[PDB]
Amino acid sequence: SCANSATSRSCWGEYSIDTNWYDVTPTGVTREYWLSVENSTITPDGYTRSAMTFNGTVPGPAIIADWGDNLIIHVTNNLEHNGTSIHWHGIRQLGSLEYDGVPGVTQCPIAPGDTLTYKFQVTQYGTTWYHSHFSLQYGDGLFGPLIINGPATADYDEDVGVIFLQDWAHESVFEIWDTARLGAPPALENTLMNGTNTFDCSASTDPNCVGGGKKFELTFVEGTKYRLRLINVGIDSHFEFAIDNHTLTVIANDLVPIVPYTTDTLLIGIGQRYDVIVEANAAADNYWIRGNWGTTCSTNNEAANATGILRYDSSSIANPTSVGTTPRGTCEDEPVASLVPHLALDVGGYSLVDEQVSSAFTNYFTWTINSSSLLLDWSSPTTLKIFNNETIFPTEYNVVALEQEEWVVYVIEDLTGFGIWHPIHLHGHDFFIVAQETDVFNSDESPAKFNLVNPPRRDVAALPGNGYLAIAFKLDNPGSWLLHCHIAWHASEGMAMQFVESQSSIAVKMTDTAIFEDTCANWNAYTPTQLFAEDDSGI
Ligand SMILES: *[C@@H]1O[C@H](CO)[C@@H](O[C@@H]2O[C@H](CO)[C@@H](O[C@@H]3O[C@H](CO)[C@@H](O)[C@H](O)[C@@H]3O)[C@H](O)[C@H]2NC(C)=O)[C@H](O)[C@H]1NC(C)=O
Ligand SMILES: *[C@@H]1O[C@H](CO)[C@@H](O[C@@H]2O[C@H](CO)[C@@H](O[C@@H]3O[C@H](CO)[C@@H](O)[C@H](O)[C@@H]3O)[C@H](O)[C@H]2NC(C)=O)[C@H](O)[C@H]1NC(C)=O
Ligand SMILES: *[C@@H]1O[C@H](CO)[C@@H](O)[C@H](O)[C@H]1NC(C)=O
Ligand SMILES: *[C@@H]1O[C@H](CO)[C@@H](O)[C@H](O)[C@H]1NC(C)=O
Ligand SMILES: *[C@@H]1O[C@H](CO)[C@@H](O)[C@H](O)[C@H]1NC(C)=O
Ligand SMILES: *[C@@H]1O[C@H](CO)[C@@H](O)[C@H](O)[C@H]1NC(C)=O
Ligand SMILES: *[C@H]1O[C@H](CO)[C@@H](O)[C@H](O)[C@@H]1O
Ligand SMILES: [Cu+2]
Ligand SMILES: [Cu+2]
Ligand SMILES: [Cu+2]
């Protein structure tokens, strides 16, 4: 039993970095939050535009808690013309399926003017984020940081918090969706680093291009070790984060602490999080912070300006003249060999489920999973079906039923030919990356090459373009769990499926059943006169 501190980050009282947090949870306290989903106007980069925000800021307010705390988060939808539904990214929701926030799966949408109070315990610690999982809303700024304090696998003095990395349009994503769904995502007008960037409005005739955008700035005190919590939250952005003339000691991936490793740059797919410790041991100077936008992965109009500024002297106003490390320049994830959980777990005996991604064109460009593109009915979410004792779901719900062989290995194959590295997010579980391969899956040979012995473990991992991703998870969380590409266009285009896991073992408190019913009653009251119908997959 030791206290967490700058020289004992492994400690968490009677618990520690060695505690199995899948099986053991500290007692904490209840923390209550009130969030308002708003229709806003912001100027993050000297361009004024609309946004959909929590509480009028991009990013939204920080939700900060300790490992074990119970969170009560009242979410009121103050948009006029969209439902909304908020997901707590990577959060296991063991026994709280109905608060996972996936509209069409775990809830009906929150109708305009309605409130839904999300309740869940945090049985994980580290860096994550919360965001709307209702259509493309997070692309208009509807996300915020969710930081759960706990132990760490390397010592550090100061936690600077999250640095968000994203693309950023100069108009609502909902304005460009009709063009994007023809099949080619647009190059967006800029990027943001923790909510800010420069933009040259000097030659603009657009009255909204008011200028004054500023670089993200981070100040170091020489000798201090800083925890930076990196999240890629773009619509369709890949990053390779780096700080010139500094080394990153990587200590967590998503919500899983790893054996520290050092790296000059850090590949980060959408929805992925890393925790790094940077020691401020360079010559004191201004250094460029590089997002290293992956131009081979997706387009942006201003890729080279996905940068911020590290200062050792905060009174300096000069731009860095530092020289960047040459990026690997791929759309890959960090190498599997680098991502070794500190808490070592092995994958047990399993049953294999194989699915294949392709594309089709119906009304617009769609992605298919075993020939079916996800299309959900917001007024009949999977959980509603489950509470009605339905076990056969619509084809377009892309349900795979799991029932106990205590483990599943889920192989998803890219048969599209496109060579996109798709960030695949699984809800309700950390998975084990048993293979992440650039090659064709062979059901007779590939399983023999799976790594079942402490493989990487996280909640978002790349399906390699033209390859396969084999992820294992244990049947330990009855529910209906969405799995999808986190490239927002692709999710909206149906690149998703869901696991209905141990359906008959789902338990929901009567109070939460009543709440769920109320949410859907209110949604159903809104839809007859909504201005805008569902026009994508729902998620
Ligand atoms: C959620 O609310 C947003 C409003 O904030 C809705 O966005 C609207 O979406 C419609 C349908 O896609 C857009 O119409 C299209 O606009 C483009 C661009 O001018 C045009 O080329 C198309 O032919 C079509 O008219 C509309 O622009 C857009 N409105 C705004 C202000 O962005 C969205 O549909 C809502 N979704 C739900 C599910 O309630
Ligand atoms: C990126 O932008 C956000 C601001 O949009 C910064 O978020 C800030 O993060 C820090 C550290 O995690 C938060 O500090 C904590 O505040 C709470 C509540 O009062 C307190 O309990 C803790 O002791 C700690 O001071 C801070 O709340 C938060 N600010 C906002 C507005 O949410 C973040 O720091 C930026 N990243 C960098 C590297 O600058
Ligand atoms: C968010 O905004 C709403 C509406 O004004 C308010 O009730 C709530 O307290 C605010 N929450 C935070 C965290 O500021
Ligand atoms: C947000 O406000 C804008 C400007 O009034 C409006 O055009 C748009 O429909 C609103 N969006 C939603 C989702 O309510
Ligand atoms: C998806 O299709 C492939 C190829 O036909 C088949 O091998 C696999 O079992 C299918 N998966 C499921 C879950 O239906
Ligand atoms: C679902 O099954 C349970 C268990 O038998 C039963 O109590 C409940 O009423 C059922 N509900 C419906 C709507 O079929
Ligand atoms: C993470 O660790 C692996 C194995 O040592 C390296 O191959 C990689 O480049 C990174 O350091
Ligand atoms: Cu997410
Ligand atoms: Cu994708
Ligand atoms: Cu998701």
XYZ file of C-alpha atoms and ligand atoms in Angstrom:
687
model
C 0.000 0.000 0.000
C 1.684 3.163 -1.233
C 0.605 6.568 -2.324
C 0.611 7.696 -5.901
C 3.141 10.479 -6.369
C 5.668 11.915 -8.830
C 8.194 9.247 -7.829
C 5.705 6.392 -7.344
C 3.183 6.619 -10.199
C 2.751 2.795 -10.064
C 1.050 3.160 -6.683
C -2.643 3.655 -6.114
C -3.000 2.993 -2.355
C -3.948 -0.643 -1.825
C -4.102 -0.955 -5.611
C -1.530 -0.392 -8.225
C -0.478 -0.777 -11.777
C -0.542 -4.534 -11.132
C -4.167 -4.634 -10.097
C -6.355 -6.433 -12.568
C -8.876 -3.678 -13.257
C -11.089 -6.037 -15.320
C -11.776 -7.943 -12.099
C -11.080 -5.437 -9.278
C -12.309 -1.844 -8.813
C -11.456 0.683 -6.039
C -14.324 2.349 -4.243
C -14.467 5.993 -5.034
C -17.135 8.612 -4.808
C -20.001 9.813 -6.860
C -19.341 12.661 -9.231
C -22.103 14.556 -10.871
C -21.956 16.588 -14.091
C -24.506 18.556 -16.127
C -23.819 18.846 -19.840
C -25.703 20.767 -22.425
C -25.478 19.834 -26.035
C -25.570 23.113 -27.831
C -25.740 24.747 -31.104
C -22.876 27.149 -31.081
C -20.719 29.637 -32.867
C -17.007 29.430 -32.415
C -13.776 30.780 -33.866
C -11.001 28.216 -33.167
C -8.607 29.097 -35.932
C -9.678 32.599 -36.991
C -12.577 31.170 -38.949
C -16.021 31.662 -37.452
C -18.443 28.833 -37.920
C -21.228 26.828 -36.403
C -20.604 24.007 -34.004
C -22.318 21.369 -31.909
C -20.719 21.474 -28.530
C -20.931 20.458 -24.978
C -21.402 23.695 -23.140
C -20.244 26.040 -25.839
C -16.613 25.037 -26.134
C -14.539 22.834 -28.402
C -13.367 20.597 -26.835
C -16.144 20.206 -24.344
C -15.662 20.374 -20.614
C -13.269 17.921 -19.002
C -14.847 15.145 -17.110
C -12.308 14.118 -14.543
C -12.663 11.332 -12.055
C -10.733 8.683 -10.218
C -10.588 5.016 -10.881
C -13.629 3.494 -9.232
C -15.795 6.646 -9.041
C -19.483 6.555 -10.020
C -20.356 9.119 -12.621
C -23.751 10.773 -13.036
C -23.776 12.856 -16.169
C -27.019 14.710 -17.018
C -27.073 15.345 -20.688
C -29.684 17.774 -22.031
C -30.079 18.090 -25.696
C -30.446 21.733 -26.520
C -30.096 21.295 -30.210
C -33.316 22.109 -32.078
C -32.978 19.891 -35.109
C -31.063 16.690 -34.139
C -31.334 13.996 -31.599
C -28.102 13.219 -29.832
C -26.670 10.366 -27.815
C -23.323 10.486 -25.990
C -20.756 7.738 -25.806
C -17.959 7.367 -23.173
C -15.227 6.117 -25.405
C -13.633 2.854 -24.348
C -15.654 2.733 -21.210
C -16.522 -0.894 -20.522
C -20.024 -0.256 -19.203
C -20.061 -3.564 -17.394
C -23.657 -3.768 -16.173
C -24.542 -0.408 -17.681
C -25.123 -1.265 -21.302
C -27.923 1.261 -21.520
C -25.530 4.125 -20.920
C -23.028 3.308 -23.626
C -24.620 6.042 -25.720
C -25.029 4.415 -29.111
C -28.316 5.488 -30.680
C -30.001 2.608 -32.427
C -28.078 0.117 -30.234
C -28.151 1.017 -26.551
C -30.725 3.797 -26.592
C -33.100 5.844 -28.586
C -31.704 9.276 -29.280
C -32.195 12.113 -26.816
C -34.814 14.266 -28.399
C -34.384 18.032 -28.507
C -35.169 19.446 -25.109
C -34.940 16.098 -23.401
C -32.398 14.995 -20.798
C -30.807 11.628 -20.209
C -28.653 10.982 -17.162
C -25.842 8.634 -17.904
C -24.750 6.557 -14.964
C -21.743 4.325 -14.821
C -18.776 3.414 -12.753
C -15.305 3.903 -14.141
C -13.605 0.523 -13.678
C -10.640 1.685 -15.886
C -8.103 4.476 -15.592
C -6.264 6.571 -18.109
C -7.048 8.821 -21.062
C -10.213 8.818 -23.051
C -12.866 11.108 -24.423
C -16.618 11.376 -24.669
C -18.468 12.252 -27.774
C -21.627 12.144 -29.602
C -22.253 8.838 -31.344
C -25.282 10.269 -33.189
C -24.394 10.549 -36.825
C -21.573 12.993 -37.688
C -22.024 15.288 -34.704
C -18.617 14.820 -33.161
C -17.185 16.208 -36.370
C -18.811 19.538 -35.524
C -17.034 19.664 -32.139
C -19.250 17.375 -29.964
C -16.525 15.751 -27.904
C -14.593 16.377 -24.734
C -11.914 14.763 -22.620
C -12.696 12.045 -20.045
C -9.686 11.555 -17.783
C -9.761 8.931 -15.094
C -6.914 9.182 -12.651
C -5.112 6.133 -11.561
C -1.629 4.643 -11.554
C 0.897 4.706 -14.406
C 3.802 2.663 -15.652
C 6.395 5.476 -15.525
C 7.008 8.350 -13.182
C 6.218 11.953 -14.114
C 5.885 15.222 -12.327
C 3.080 17.029 -14.047
C -0.016 16.000 -16.020
C -0.721 18.553 -18.743
C -3.855 16.919 -19.833
C -5.152 16.065 -23.197
C -3.895 17.319 -26.536
C -6.580 16.680 -29.115
C -5.507 16.187 -32.704
C -8.147 16.578 -35.471
C -9.082 17.805 -38.860
C -11.425 20.766 -38.931
C -13.885 21.913 -41.574
C -14.909 25.568 -42.112
C -18.514 24.517 -42.284
C -20.769 21.909 -40.613
C -20.019 18.343 -41.507
C -23.783 18.025 -42.177
C -23.379 20.488 -45.066
C -20.828 18.344 -46.776
C -22.293 14.905 -46.051
C -24.369 14.727 -49.266
C -21.196 15.213 -51.322
C -19.031 13.052 -49.113
C -21.480 10.115 -49.337
C -20.962 9.903 -53.112
C -17.727 8.189 -51.941
C -14.824 10.585 -51.649
C -14.407 12.372 -48.384
C -13.618 16.053 -48.777
C -10.252 17.629 -47.967
C -11.182 19.785 -44.991
C -10.013 23.367 -44.621
C -7.806 23.051 -41.669
C -6.684 21.083 -38.602
C -6.812 21.854 -34.839
C -4.372 21.030 -32.151
C -6.192 21.106 -28.839
C -8.836 23.203 -30.355
C -6.690 25.829 -32.086
C -4.610 26.616 -35.116
C -3.484 29.466 -37.345
C -5.299 30.168 -40.612
C -4.317 32.742 -43.245
C -7.380 34.859 -43.807
C -5.319 37.721 -45.422
C -6.593 37.068 -48.979
C -10.158 35.943 -47.969
C -13.409 37.576 -49.047
C -15.345 35.358 -46.638
C -16.582 37.622 -43.792
C -16.183 34.647 -41.385
C -12.473 34.462 -42.014
C -11.642 36.988 -39.299
C -8.085 35.838 -38.692
C -6.094 35.815 -35.434
C -5.967 32.010 -35.262
C -3.177 30.965 -32.966
C -0.984 27.884 -32.578
C -1.512 25.528 -29.719
C 1.151 26.317 -27.126
C 2.645 24.098 -24.481
C 5.247 25.412 -21.965
C 7.915 23.233 -20.374
C 10.080 23.877 -17.308
C 13.478 22.480 -17.883
C 13.976 19.108 -16.112
C 10.302 18.369 -15.425
C 8.645 15.178 -16.744
C 5.193 15.801 -18.294
C 2.391 13.415 -19.029
C 0.705 14.345 -22.325
C -2.493 12.564 -23.212
C -2.862 12.352 -26.970
C -6.210 11.710 -28.710
C -6.932 11.670 -32.379
C -10.559 12.885 -32.692
C -10.745 13.825 -36.374
C -13.540 12.945 -38.828
C -10.911 11.378 -41.138
C -7.397 12.164 -39.975
C -4.293 10.146 -39.225
C -1.499 11.563 -37.135
C 2.084 10.814 -36.326
C 2.667 12.985 -33.317
C 6.145 14.228 -32.556
C 7.803 16.990 -30.684
C 10.986 18.209 -32.313
C 14.140 17.233 -30.430
C 12.140 15.399 -27.815
C 11.522 11.745 -27.109
C 8.180 10.284 -26.161
C 8.060 7.563 -23.541
C 4.818 5.767 -24.342
C 3.065 4.456 -21.148
C -0.497 3.644 -22.142
C -2.462 2.897 -25.136
C -6.119 3.697 -25.004
C -7.195 2.723 -21.405
C -4.455 0.090 -20.997
C -1.128 0.852 -19.438
C 1.826 -0.599 -21.364
C 5.479 -1.340 -20.678
C 7.116 1.990 -21.410
C 8.949 2.331 -24.746
C 10.603 5.357 -26.294
C 9.807 6.698 -29.680
C 10.411 9.862 -31.683
C 6.998 9.830 -33.377
C 3.717 8.193 -32.499
C 1.222 6.871 -35.025
C -2.328 7.534 -33.862
C -5.562 6.448 -35.510
C -8.942 8.006 -34.962
C -10.217 7.197 -31.502
C -6.904 5.983 -30.295
C -5.285 7.476 -27.255
C -1.737 7.346 -26.038
C -0.204 8.548 -22.820
C 3.386 9.758 -23.116
C 5.903 11.120 -20.719
C 8.165 13.811 -22.145
C 11.131 14.945 -20.152
C 11.940 18.596 -20.806
C 15.687 17.970 -21.248
C 16.318 19.840 -24.548
C 18.097 23.139 -24.918
C 15.568 25.659 -23.844
C 14.010 27.010 -27.016
C 10.766 26.853 -29.006
C 10.118 23.555 -30.728
C 7.538 22.579 -33.252
C 4.855 20.090 -32.096
C 3.999 18.089 -35.207
C 0.683 16.289 -35.818
C 2.260 14.944 -39.022
C -0.967 14.700 -40.805
C -0.958 11.456 -42.833
C -1.351 12.754 -46.368
C -1.190 9.197 -47.764
C -4.138 8.376 -45.430
C -6.576 11.156 -46.170
C -6.477 14.646 -47.649
C -6.432 18.055 -45.945
C -5.976 21.524 -47.382
C -3.499 22.513 -44.807
C -1.632 19.377 -43.824
C 1.668 21.067 -43.186
C 0.095 23.322 -40.539
C -1.006 20.581 -38.258
C 1.503 21.841 -35.741
C 1.752 23.601 -32.374
C 4.492 25.226 -30.381
C 6.418 23.971 -27.413
C 8.199 26.805 -25.478
C 10.662 26.514 -22.586
C 10.321 30.186 -22.188
C 6.716 31.209 -22.233
C 7.606 34.864 -22.818
C 8.973 33.941 -26.238
C 6.660 34.784 -29.119
C 8.909 33.477 -31.920
C 8.030 30.559 -34.093
C 10.229 27.546 -33.673
C 12.976 26.982 -36.146
C 13.468 23.404 -35.002
C 14.011 20.578 -37.447
C 11.547 17.737 -37.379
C 12.267 14.075 -37.237
C 11.402 12.418 -40.507
C 8.061 10.667 -39.996
C 7.601 7.077 -40.898
C 4.732 8.559 -42.911
C 2.352 5.604 -42.899
C -1.276 5.103 -41.848
C -0.289 2.257 -39.569
C -0.785 1.865 -35.896
C 2.243 1.685 -33.567
C 3.970 -1.668 -34.130
C 2.389 -4.572 -32.265
C 5.766 -5.472 -30.771
C 5.873 -2.110 -29.011
C 2.502 -2.375 -27.337
C 2.856 -4.666 -24.386
C 0.385 -4.300 -21.618
C 1.919 -3.953 -18.178
C -0.865 -6.194 -16.777
C -0.204 -9.299 -18.800
C -3.230 -11.311 -19.991
C -3.501 -14.147 -22.402
C -6.241 -15.085 -24.705
C -7.890 -18.345 -23.859
C -9.639 -21.011 -25.812
C -11.707 -19.368 -28.521
C -14.308 -19.510 -31.164
C -13.482 -17.621 -34.450
C -15.855 -15.267 -36.283
C -14.763 -13.995 -39.636
C -16.248 -11.031 -41.445
C -15.334 -9.179 -44.606
C -15.481 -5.597 -45.519
C -16.433 -4.563 -49.007
C -18.207 -1.610 -50.616
C -21.406 -1.041 -52.538
C -23.406 1.809 -53.986
C -27.109 1.970 -53.318
C -28.453 5.491 -52.749
C -24.825 6.463 -52.042
C -21.507 4.836 -51.240
C -21.870 2.188 -48.543
C -19.509 -0.129 -46.771
C -20.595 -3.631 -46.208
C -19.851 -6.245 -43.587
C -20.528 -9.679 -45.077
C -22.532 -7.930 -47.750
C -24.686 -5.863 -45.468
C -24.279 -2.155 -44.658
C -25.348 -1.105 -41.112
C -28.602 0.806 -40.984
C -30.241 1.307 -37.615
C -33.667 2.401 -36.579
C -33.245 5.000 -33.836
C -36.730 4.241 -32.514
C -36.020 0.497 -32.276
C -32.554 0.170 -30.941
C -31.081 -3.283 -30.461
C -31.592 -3.023 -26.699
C -35.251 -2.232 -27.182
C -35.475 -5.419 -29.246
C -33.657 -7.306 -26.568
C -35.948 -5.985 -23.779
C -38.781 -7.319 -25.996
C -37.159 -10.764 -25.991
C -36.304 -10.637 -29.717
C -33.300 -12.790 -30.694
C -33.525 -12.418 -34.491
C -32.530 -8.987 -35.639
C -32.832 -7.101 -38.898
C -30.254 -7.995 -41.425
C -29.000 -4.432 -41.570
C -28.350 -4.432 -37.786
C -25.336 -6.705 -38.672
C -25.711 -8.703 -35.480
C -23.328 -11.400 -34.543
C -24.656 -13.336 -31.532
C -22.127 -14.469 -29.011
C -22.966 -17.015 -26.340
C -20.540 -19.254 -24.524
C -15.165 -21.207 -26.105
C -15.216 -18.366 -23.349
C -13.306 -16.172 -25.873
C -14.116 -14.919 -29.331
C -11.568 -14.045 -31.977
C -13.134 -11.679 -34.432
C -11.345 -11.429 -37.804
C -12.271 -8.496 -39.971
C -10.849 -8.497 -43.466
C -10.455 -5.666 -45.887
C -11.647 -6.918 -49.241
C -12.307 -3.436 -50.642
C -8.959 -3.114 -52.416
C -8.627 0.468 -51.107
C -5.652 0.206 -48.797
C -7.242 2.484 -46.196
C -6.177 1.650 -42.618
C -9.531 1.774 -40.861
C -9.613 2.560 -37.116
C -11.850 -0.120 -35.707
C -13.543 0.610 -32.392
C -15.159 -2.132 -30.284
C -17.623 -1.101 -27.552
C -17.980 -2.920 -24.220
C -14.564 -4.517 -24.274
C -10.861 -4.066 -24.524
C -9.748 -6.417 -27.216
C -6.516 -8.284 -27.798
C -4.843 -7.683 -31.100
C -3.887 -11.282 -31.927
C -3.029 -10.292 -35.497
C -2.842 -7.027 -37.359
C -1.615 -8.061 -40.744
C -0.945 -6.697 -44.157
C -1.965 -9.815 -46.070
C -4.884 -11.927 -46.982
C -6.461 -13.838 -44.133
C -6.275 -17.604 -44.567
C -8.631 -19.442 -42.235
C -6.414 -22.567 -42.312
C -3.039 -20.848 -41.773
C -3.459 -17.369 -40.254
C -4.842 -18.482 -36.861
C -1.613 -20.399 -36.213
C 0.267 -17.108 -36.325
C -2.039 -15.300 -33.795
C -0.332 -14.060 -30.727
C -2.394 -15.125 -27.698
C 0.265 -14.333 -25.115
C -0.041 -10.822 -23.773
C -0.734 -9.219 -27.238
C -1.565 -5.550 -27.481
C -4.797 -4.715 -25.706
C -6.866 -1.609 -26.343
C -10.191 -0.494 -27.854
C -9.374 1.060 -31.218
C -7.077 -0.685 -33.706
C -6.372 -0.401 -37.393
C -7.753 -2.789 -39.943
C -4.747 -2.651 -42.317
C -5.633 -1.640 -45.801
C -5.932 -4.816 -47.891
C -5.275 -6.874 -44.761
C -6.891 -8.199 -41.658
C -7.342 -7.470 -38.009
C -7.944 -10.322 -35.620
C -9.093 -9.101 -32.192
C -9.969 -11.335 -29.255
C -12.233 -10.531 -26.356
C -13.756 -12.533 -23.569
C -17.449 -13.124 -23.176
C -17.534 -11.101 -19.965
C -20.032 -8.305 -20.639
C -23.560 -9.170 -21.681
C -24.891 -6.512 -24.052
C -25.178 -5.194 -27.530
C -21.841 -3.894 -28.568
C -21.184 -1.878 -31.601
C -17.997 -2.400 -33.637
C -17.217 0.075 -36.335
C -14.805 2.094 -38.311
C -14.222 5.423 -36.525
C -13.639 7.350 -39.738
C -16.901 9.257 -39.381
C -17.839 9.052 -43.069
C -17.348 5.286 -43.054
C -19.396 4.816 -39.927
C -22.174 6.882 -41.429
C -21.753 4.821 -44.639
C -22.413 1.684 -42.584
C -18.955 0.300 -41.879
C -20.130 -1.338 -38.726
C -21.616 -4.344 -37.045
C -22.627 -5.362 -33.535
C -22.282 -8.208 -31.172
C -25.258 -9.277 -29.210
C -23.423 -10.957 -26.356
C -25.082 -13.295 -23.914
C -28.364 -11.623 -24.470
C -30.273 -13.485 -21.815
C -27.683 -12.487 -19.225
C -28.240 -8.750 -19.644
C -29.678 -7.246 -16.432
C -31.054 -3.768 -16.255
C -32.392 -2.034 -13.135
C -36.090 -1.256 -13.278
C -35.223 2.409 -12.829
C -32.945 2.332 -15.920
C -35.592 0.431 -17.927
C -38.098 3.139 -17.100
C -35.604 5.833 -18.089
C -34.837 4.071 -21.369
C -38.564 3.809 -22.107
C -38.960 7.489 -21.380
C -36.138 8.426 -23.729
C -37.669 6.467 -26.555
C -41.227 7.832 -25.787
C -39.796 11.320 -26.060
C -37.915 10.498 -29.235
C -41.033 9.060 -30.829
C -42.832 12.337 -29.859
C -40.197 14.275 -31.736
C -39.857 12.290 -34.925
C -43.285 12.880 -36.532
C -42.298 16.567 -36.979
C -38.551 16.478 -37.085
C -37.041 18.756 -39.709
C -34.477 16.146 -40.669
C -34.830 12.435 -41.110
C -32.035 9.868 -40.425
C -29.897 10.005 -43.615
C -27.089 7.650 -42.688
C -26.442 4.486 -40.799
C -27.539 5.987 -37.456
C -24.200 5.681 -35.628
C -28.870 17.389 -37.835
O -28.974 18.785 -37.986
C -28.275 19.288 -39.055
C -28.462 20.785 -38.960
O -27.492 21.309 -38.069
C -28.824 18.725 -40.375
O -27.979 19.162 -41.383
C -28.638 19.400 -42.641
O -28.543 18.260 -43.432
C -29.236 18.397 -44.670
C -29.416 16.998 -45.247
O -28.124 16.523 -45.480
C -28.426 19.335 -45.552
O -29.068 19.464 -46.814
C -28.111 19.418 -47.865
O -27.288 20.570 -47.900
C -26.331 20.585 -48.939
C -25.414 21.814 -48.852
O -26.006 23.085 -49.191
C -27.099 20.445 -50.274
O -26.122 20.274 -51.290
C -27.944 19.190 -50.302
O -28.508 18.930 -51.595
C -28.925 19.201 -49.152
O -29.868 20.259 -49.271
C -28.305 20.686 -44.839
O -27.366 21.532 -45.440
C -27.884 20.483 -43.384
N -28.056 21.742 -42.661
C -27.083 22.360 -42.021
C -27.422 23.671 -41.370
O -25.962 21.912 -41.962
C -28.874 17.216 -40.358
O -29.511 16.601 -41.454
C -29.530 16.779 -39.074
N -29.652 15.338 -38.998
C -30.577 14.745 -38.276
C -30.446 13.260 -38.424
O -31.534 15.237 -37.610
C -6.101 21.260 -24.060
O -7.238 22.003 -23.840
C -7.925 21.818 -22.615
C -8.712 23.102 -22.536
O -9.681 23.041 -23.552
C -7.070 21.706 -21.330
O -7.879 20.998 -20.371
C -7.454 21.171 -19.009
O -6.777 19.995 -18.541
C -6.259 20.103 -17.215
C -5.382 18.896 -16.772
O -5.900 17.621 -17.147
C -7.449 20.342 -16.264
O -6.909 20.629 -14.999
C -7.672 20.074 -13.915
O -8.745 20.925 -13.512
C -9.594 20.291 -12.539
C -10.950 21.033 -12.338
O -10.919 22.391 -11.856
C -8.764 20.012 -11.268
O -9.521 19.072 -10.509
C -7.373 19.388 -11.530
O -6.436 19.528 -10.438
C -6.705 19.975 -12.776
O -6.233 21.312 -12.566
C -8.371 21.505 -16.669
O -9.575 21.354 -15.970
C -8.702 21.499 -18.175
N -9.351 22.751 -18.636
C -10.565 22.770 -19.208
C -11.089 24.098 -19.677
O -11.275 21.746 -19.343
C -5.740 21.021 -21.582
O -4.855 21.260 -20.515
C -5.122 21.487 -22.900
N -3.901 20.743 -23.059
C -2.745 21.315 -22.895
C -1.522 20.484 -23.005
O -2.692 22.511 -22.684
C -23.286 23.177 -19.014
O -24.257 24.091 -19.536
C -25.525 23.838 -18.906
C -26.589 24.757 -19.515
O -26.292 26.122 -19.263
C -25.431 24.023 -17.424
O -26.640 23.754 -16.736
C -24.382 23.073 -16.839
O -24.135 23.319 -15.500
C -23.087 23.370 -17.527
N -22.073 22.390 -17.136
C -20.779 22.742 -16.996
C -19.900 21.579 -16.670
O -20.342 23.895 -17.103
C -28.215 24.895 -35.359
O -28.498 26.294 -35.552
C -28.438 26.592 -36.966
C -28.525 28.120 -37.176
O -29.754 28.455 -36.597
C -29.563 25.880 -37.680
O -29.439 26.262 -39.050
C -29.379 24.380 -37.522
O -30.441 23.608 -38.020
C -29.296 24.067 -36.047
N -28.911 22.660 -35.919
C -29.480 21.850 -35.095
C -28.901 20.460 -35.084
O -30.357 22.122 -34.296
C -18.801 -13.820 -43.585
O -18.568 -14.372 -44.872
C -17.431 -15.262 -44.927
C -17.104 -15.699 -46.354
O -18.319 -16.208 -46.859
C -17.732 -16.523 -44.089
O -16.560 -17.298 -44.209
C -17.989 -16.050 -42.672
O -18.401 -17.065 -41.774
C -19.092 -14.999 -42.635
N -19.305 -14.579 -41.256
C -20.453 -14.552 -40.590
C -20.390 -14.040 -39.177
O -21.556 -14.774 -41.061
C -39.345 -10.979 -21.772
O -39.056 -12.229 -21.060
C -39.197 -12.142 -19.659
C -38.720 -13.433 -19.009
O -39.705 -14.385 -19.285
C -40.603 -11.685 -19.267
O -40.581 -11.462 -17.896
C -40.880 -10.344 -19.941
O -42.214 -9.904 -19.800
C -40.739 -10.513 -21.435
N -41.249 -9.313 -22.080
C -41.907 -9.345 -23.264
C -42.400 -7.992 -23.686
O -42.033 -10.374 -24.011
C 8.219 -0.460 -30.074
O 8.914 -1.672 -29.739
C 9.220 -2.528 -30.828
C 9.969 -3.786 -30.361
O 11.141 -3.426 -29.646
C 10.105 -1.829 -31.858
O 10.188 -2.728 -32.930
C 9.397 -0.543 -32.292
O 9.970 0.231 -33.329
C 9.094 0.322 -31.067
O 10.224 0.740 -30.330
Cu -15.091 7.078 -29.877
Cu -13.135 2.957 -42.479
Cu -18.110 3.709 -31.291
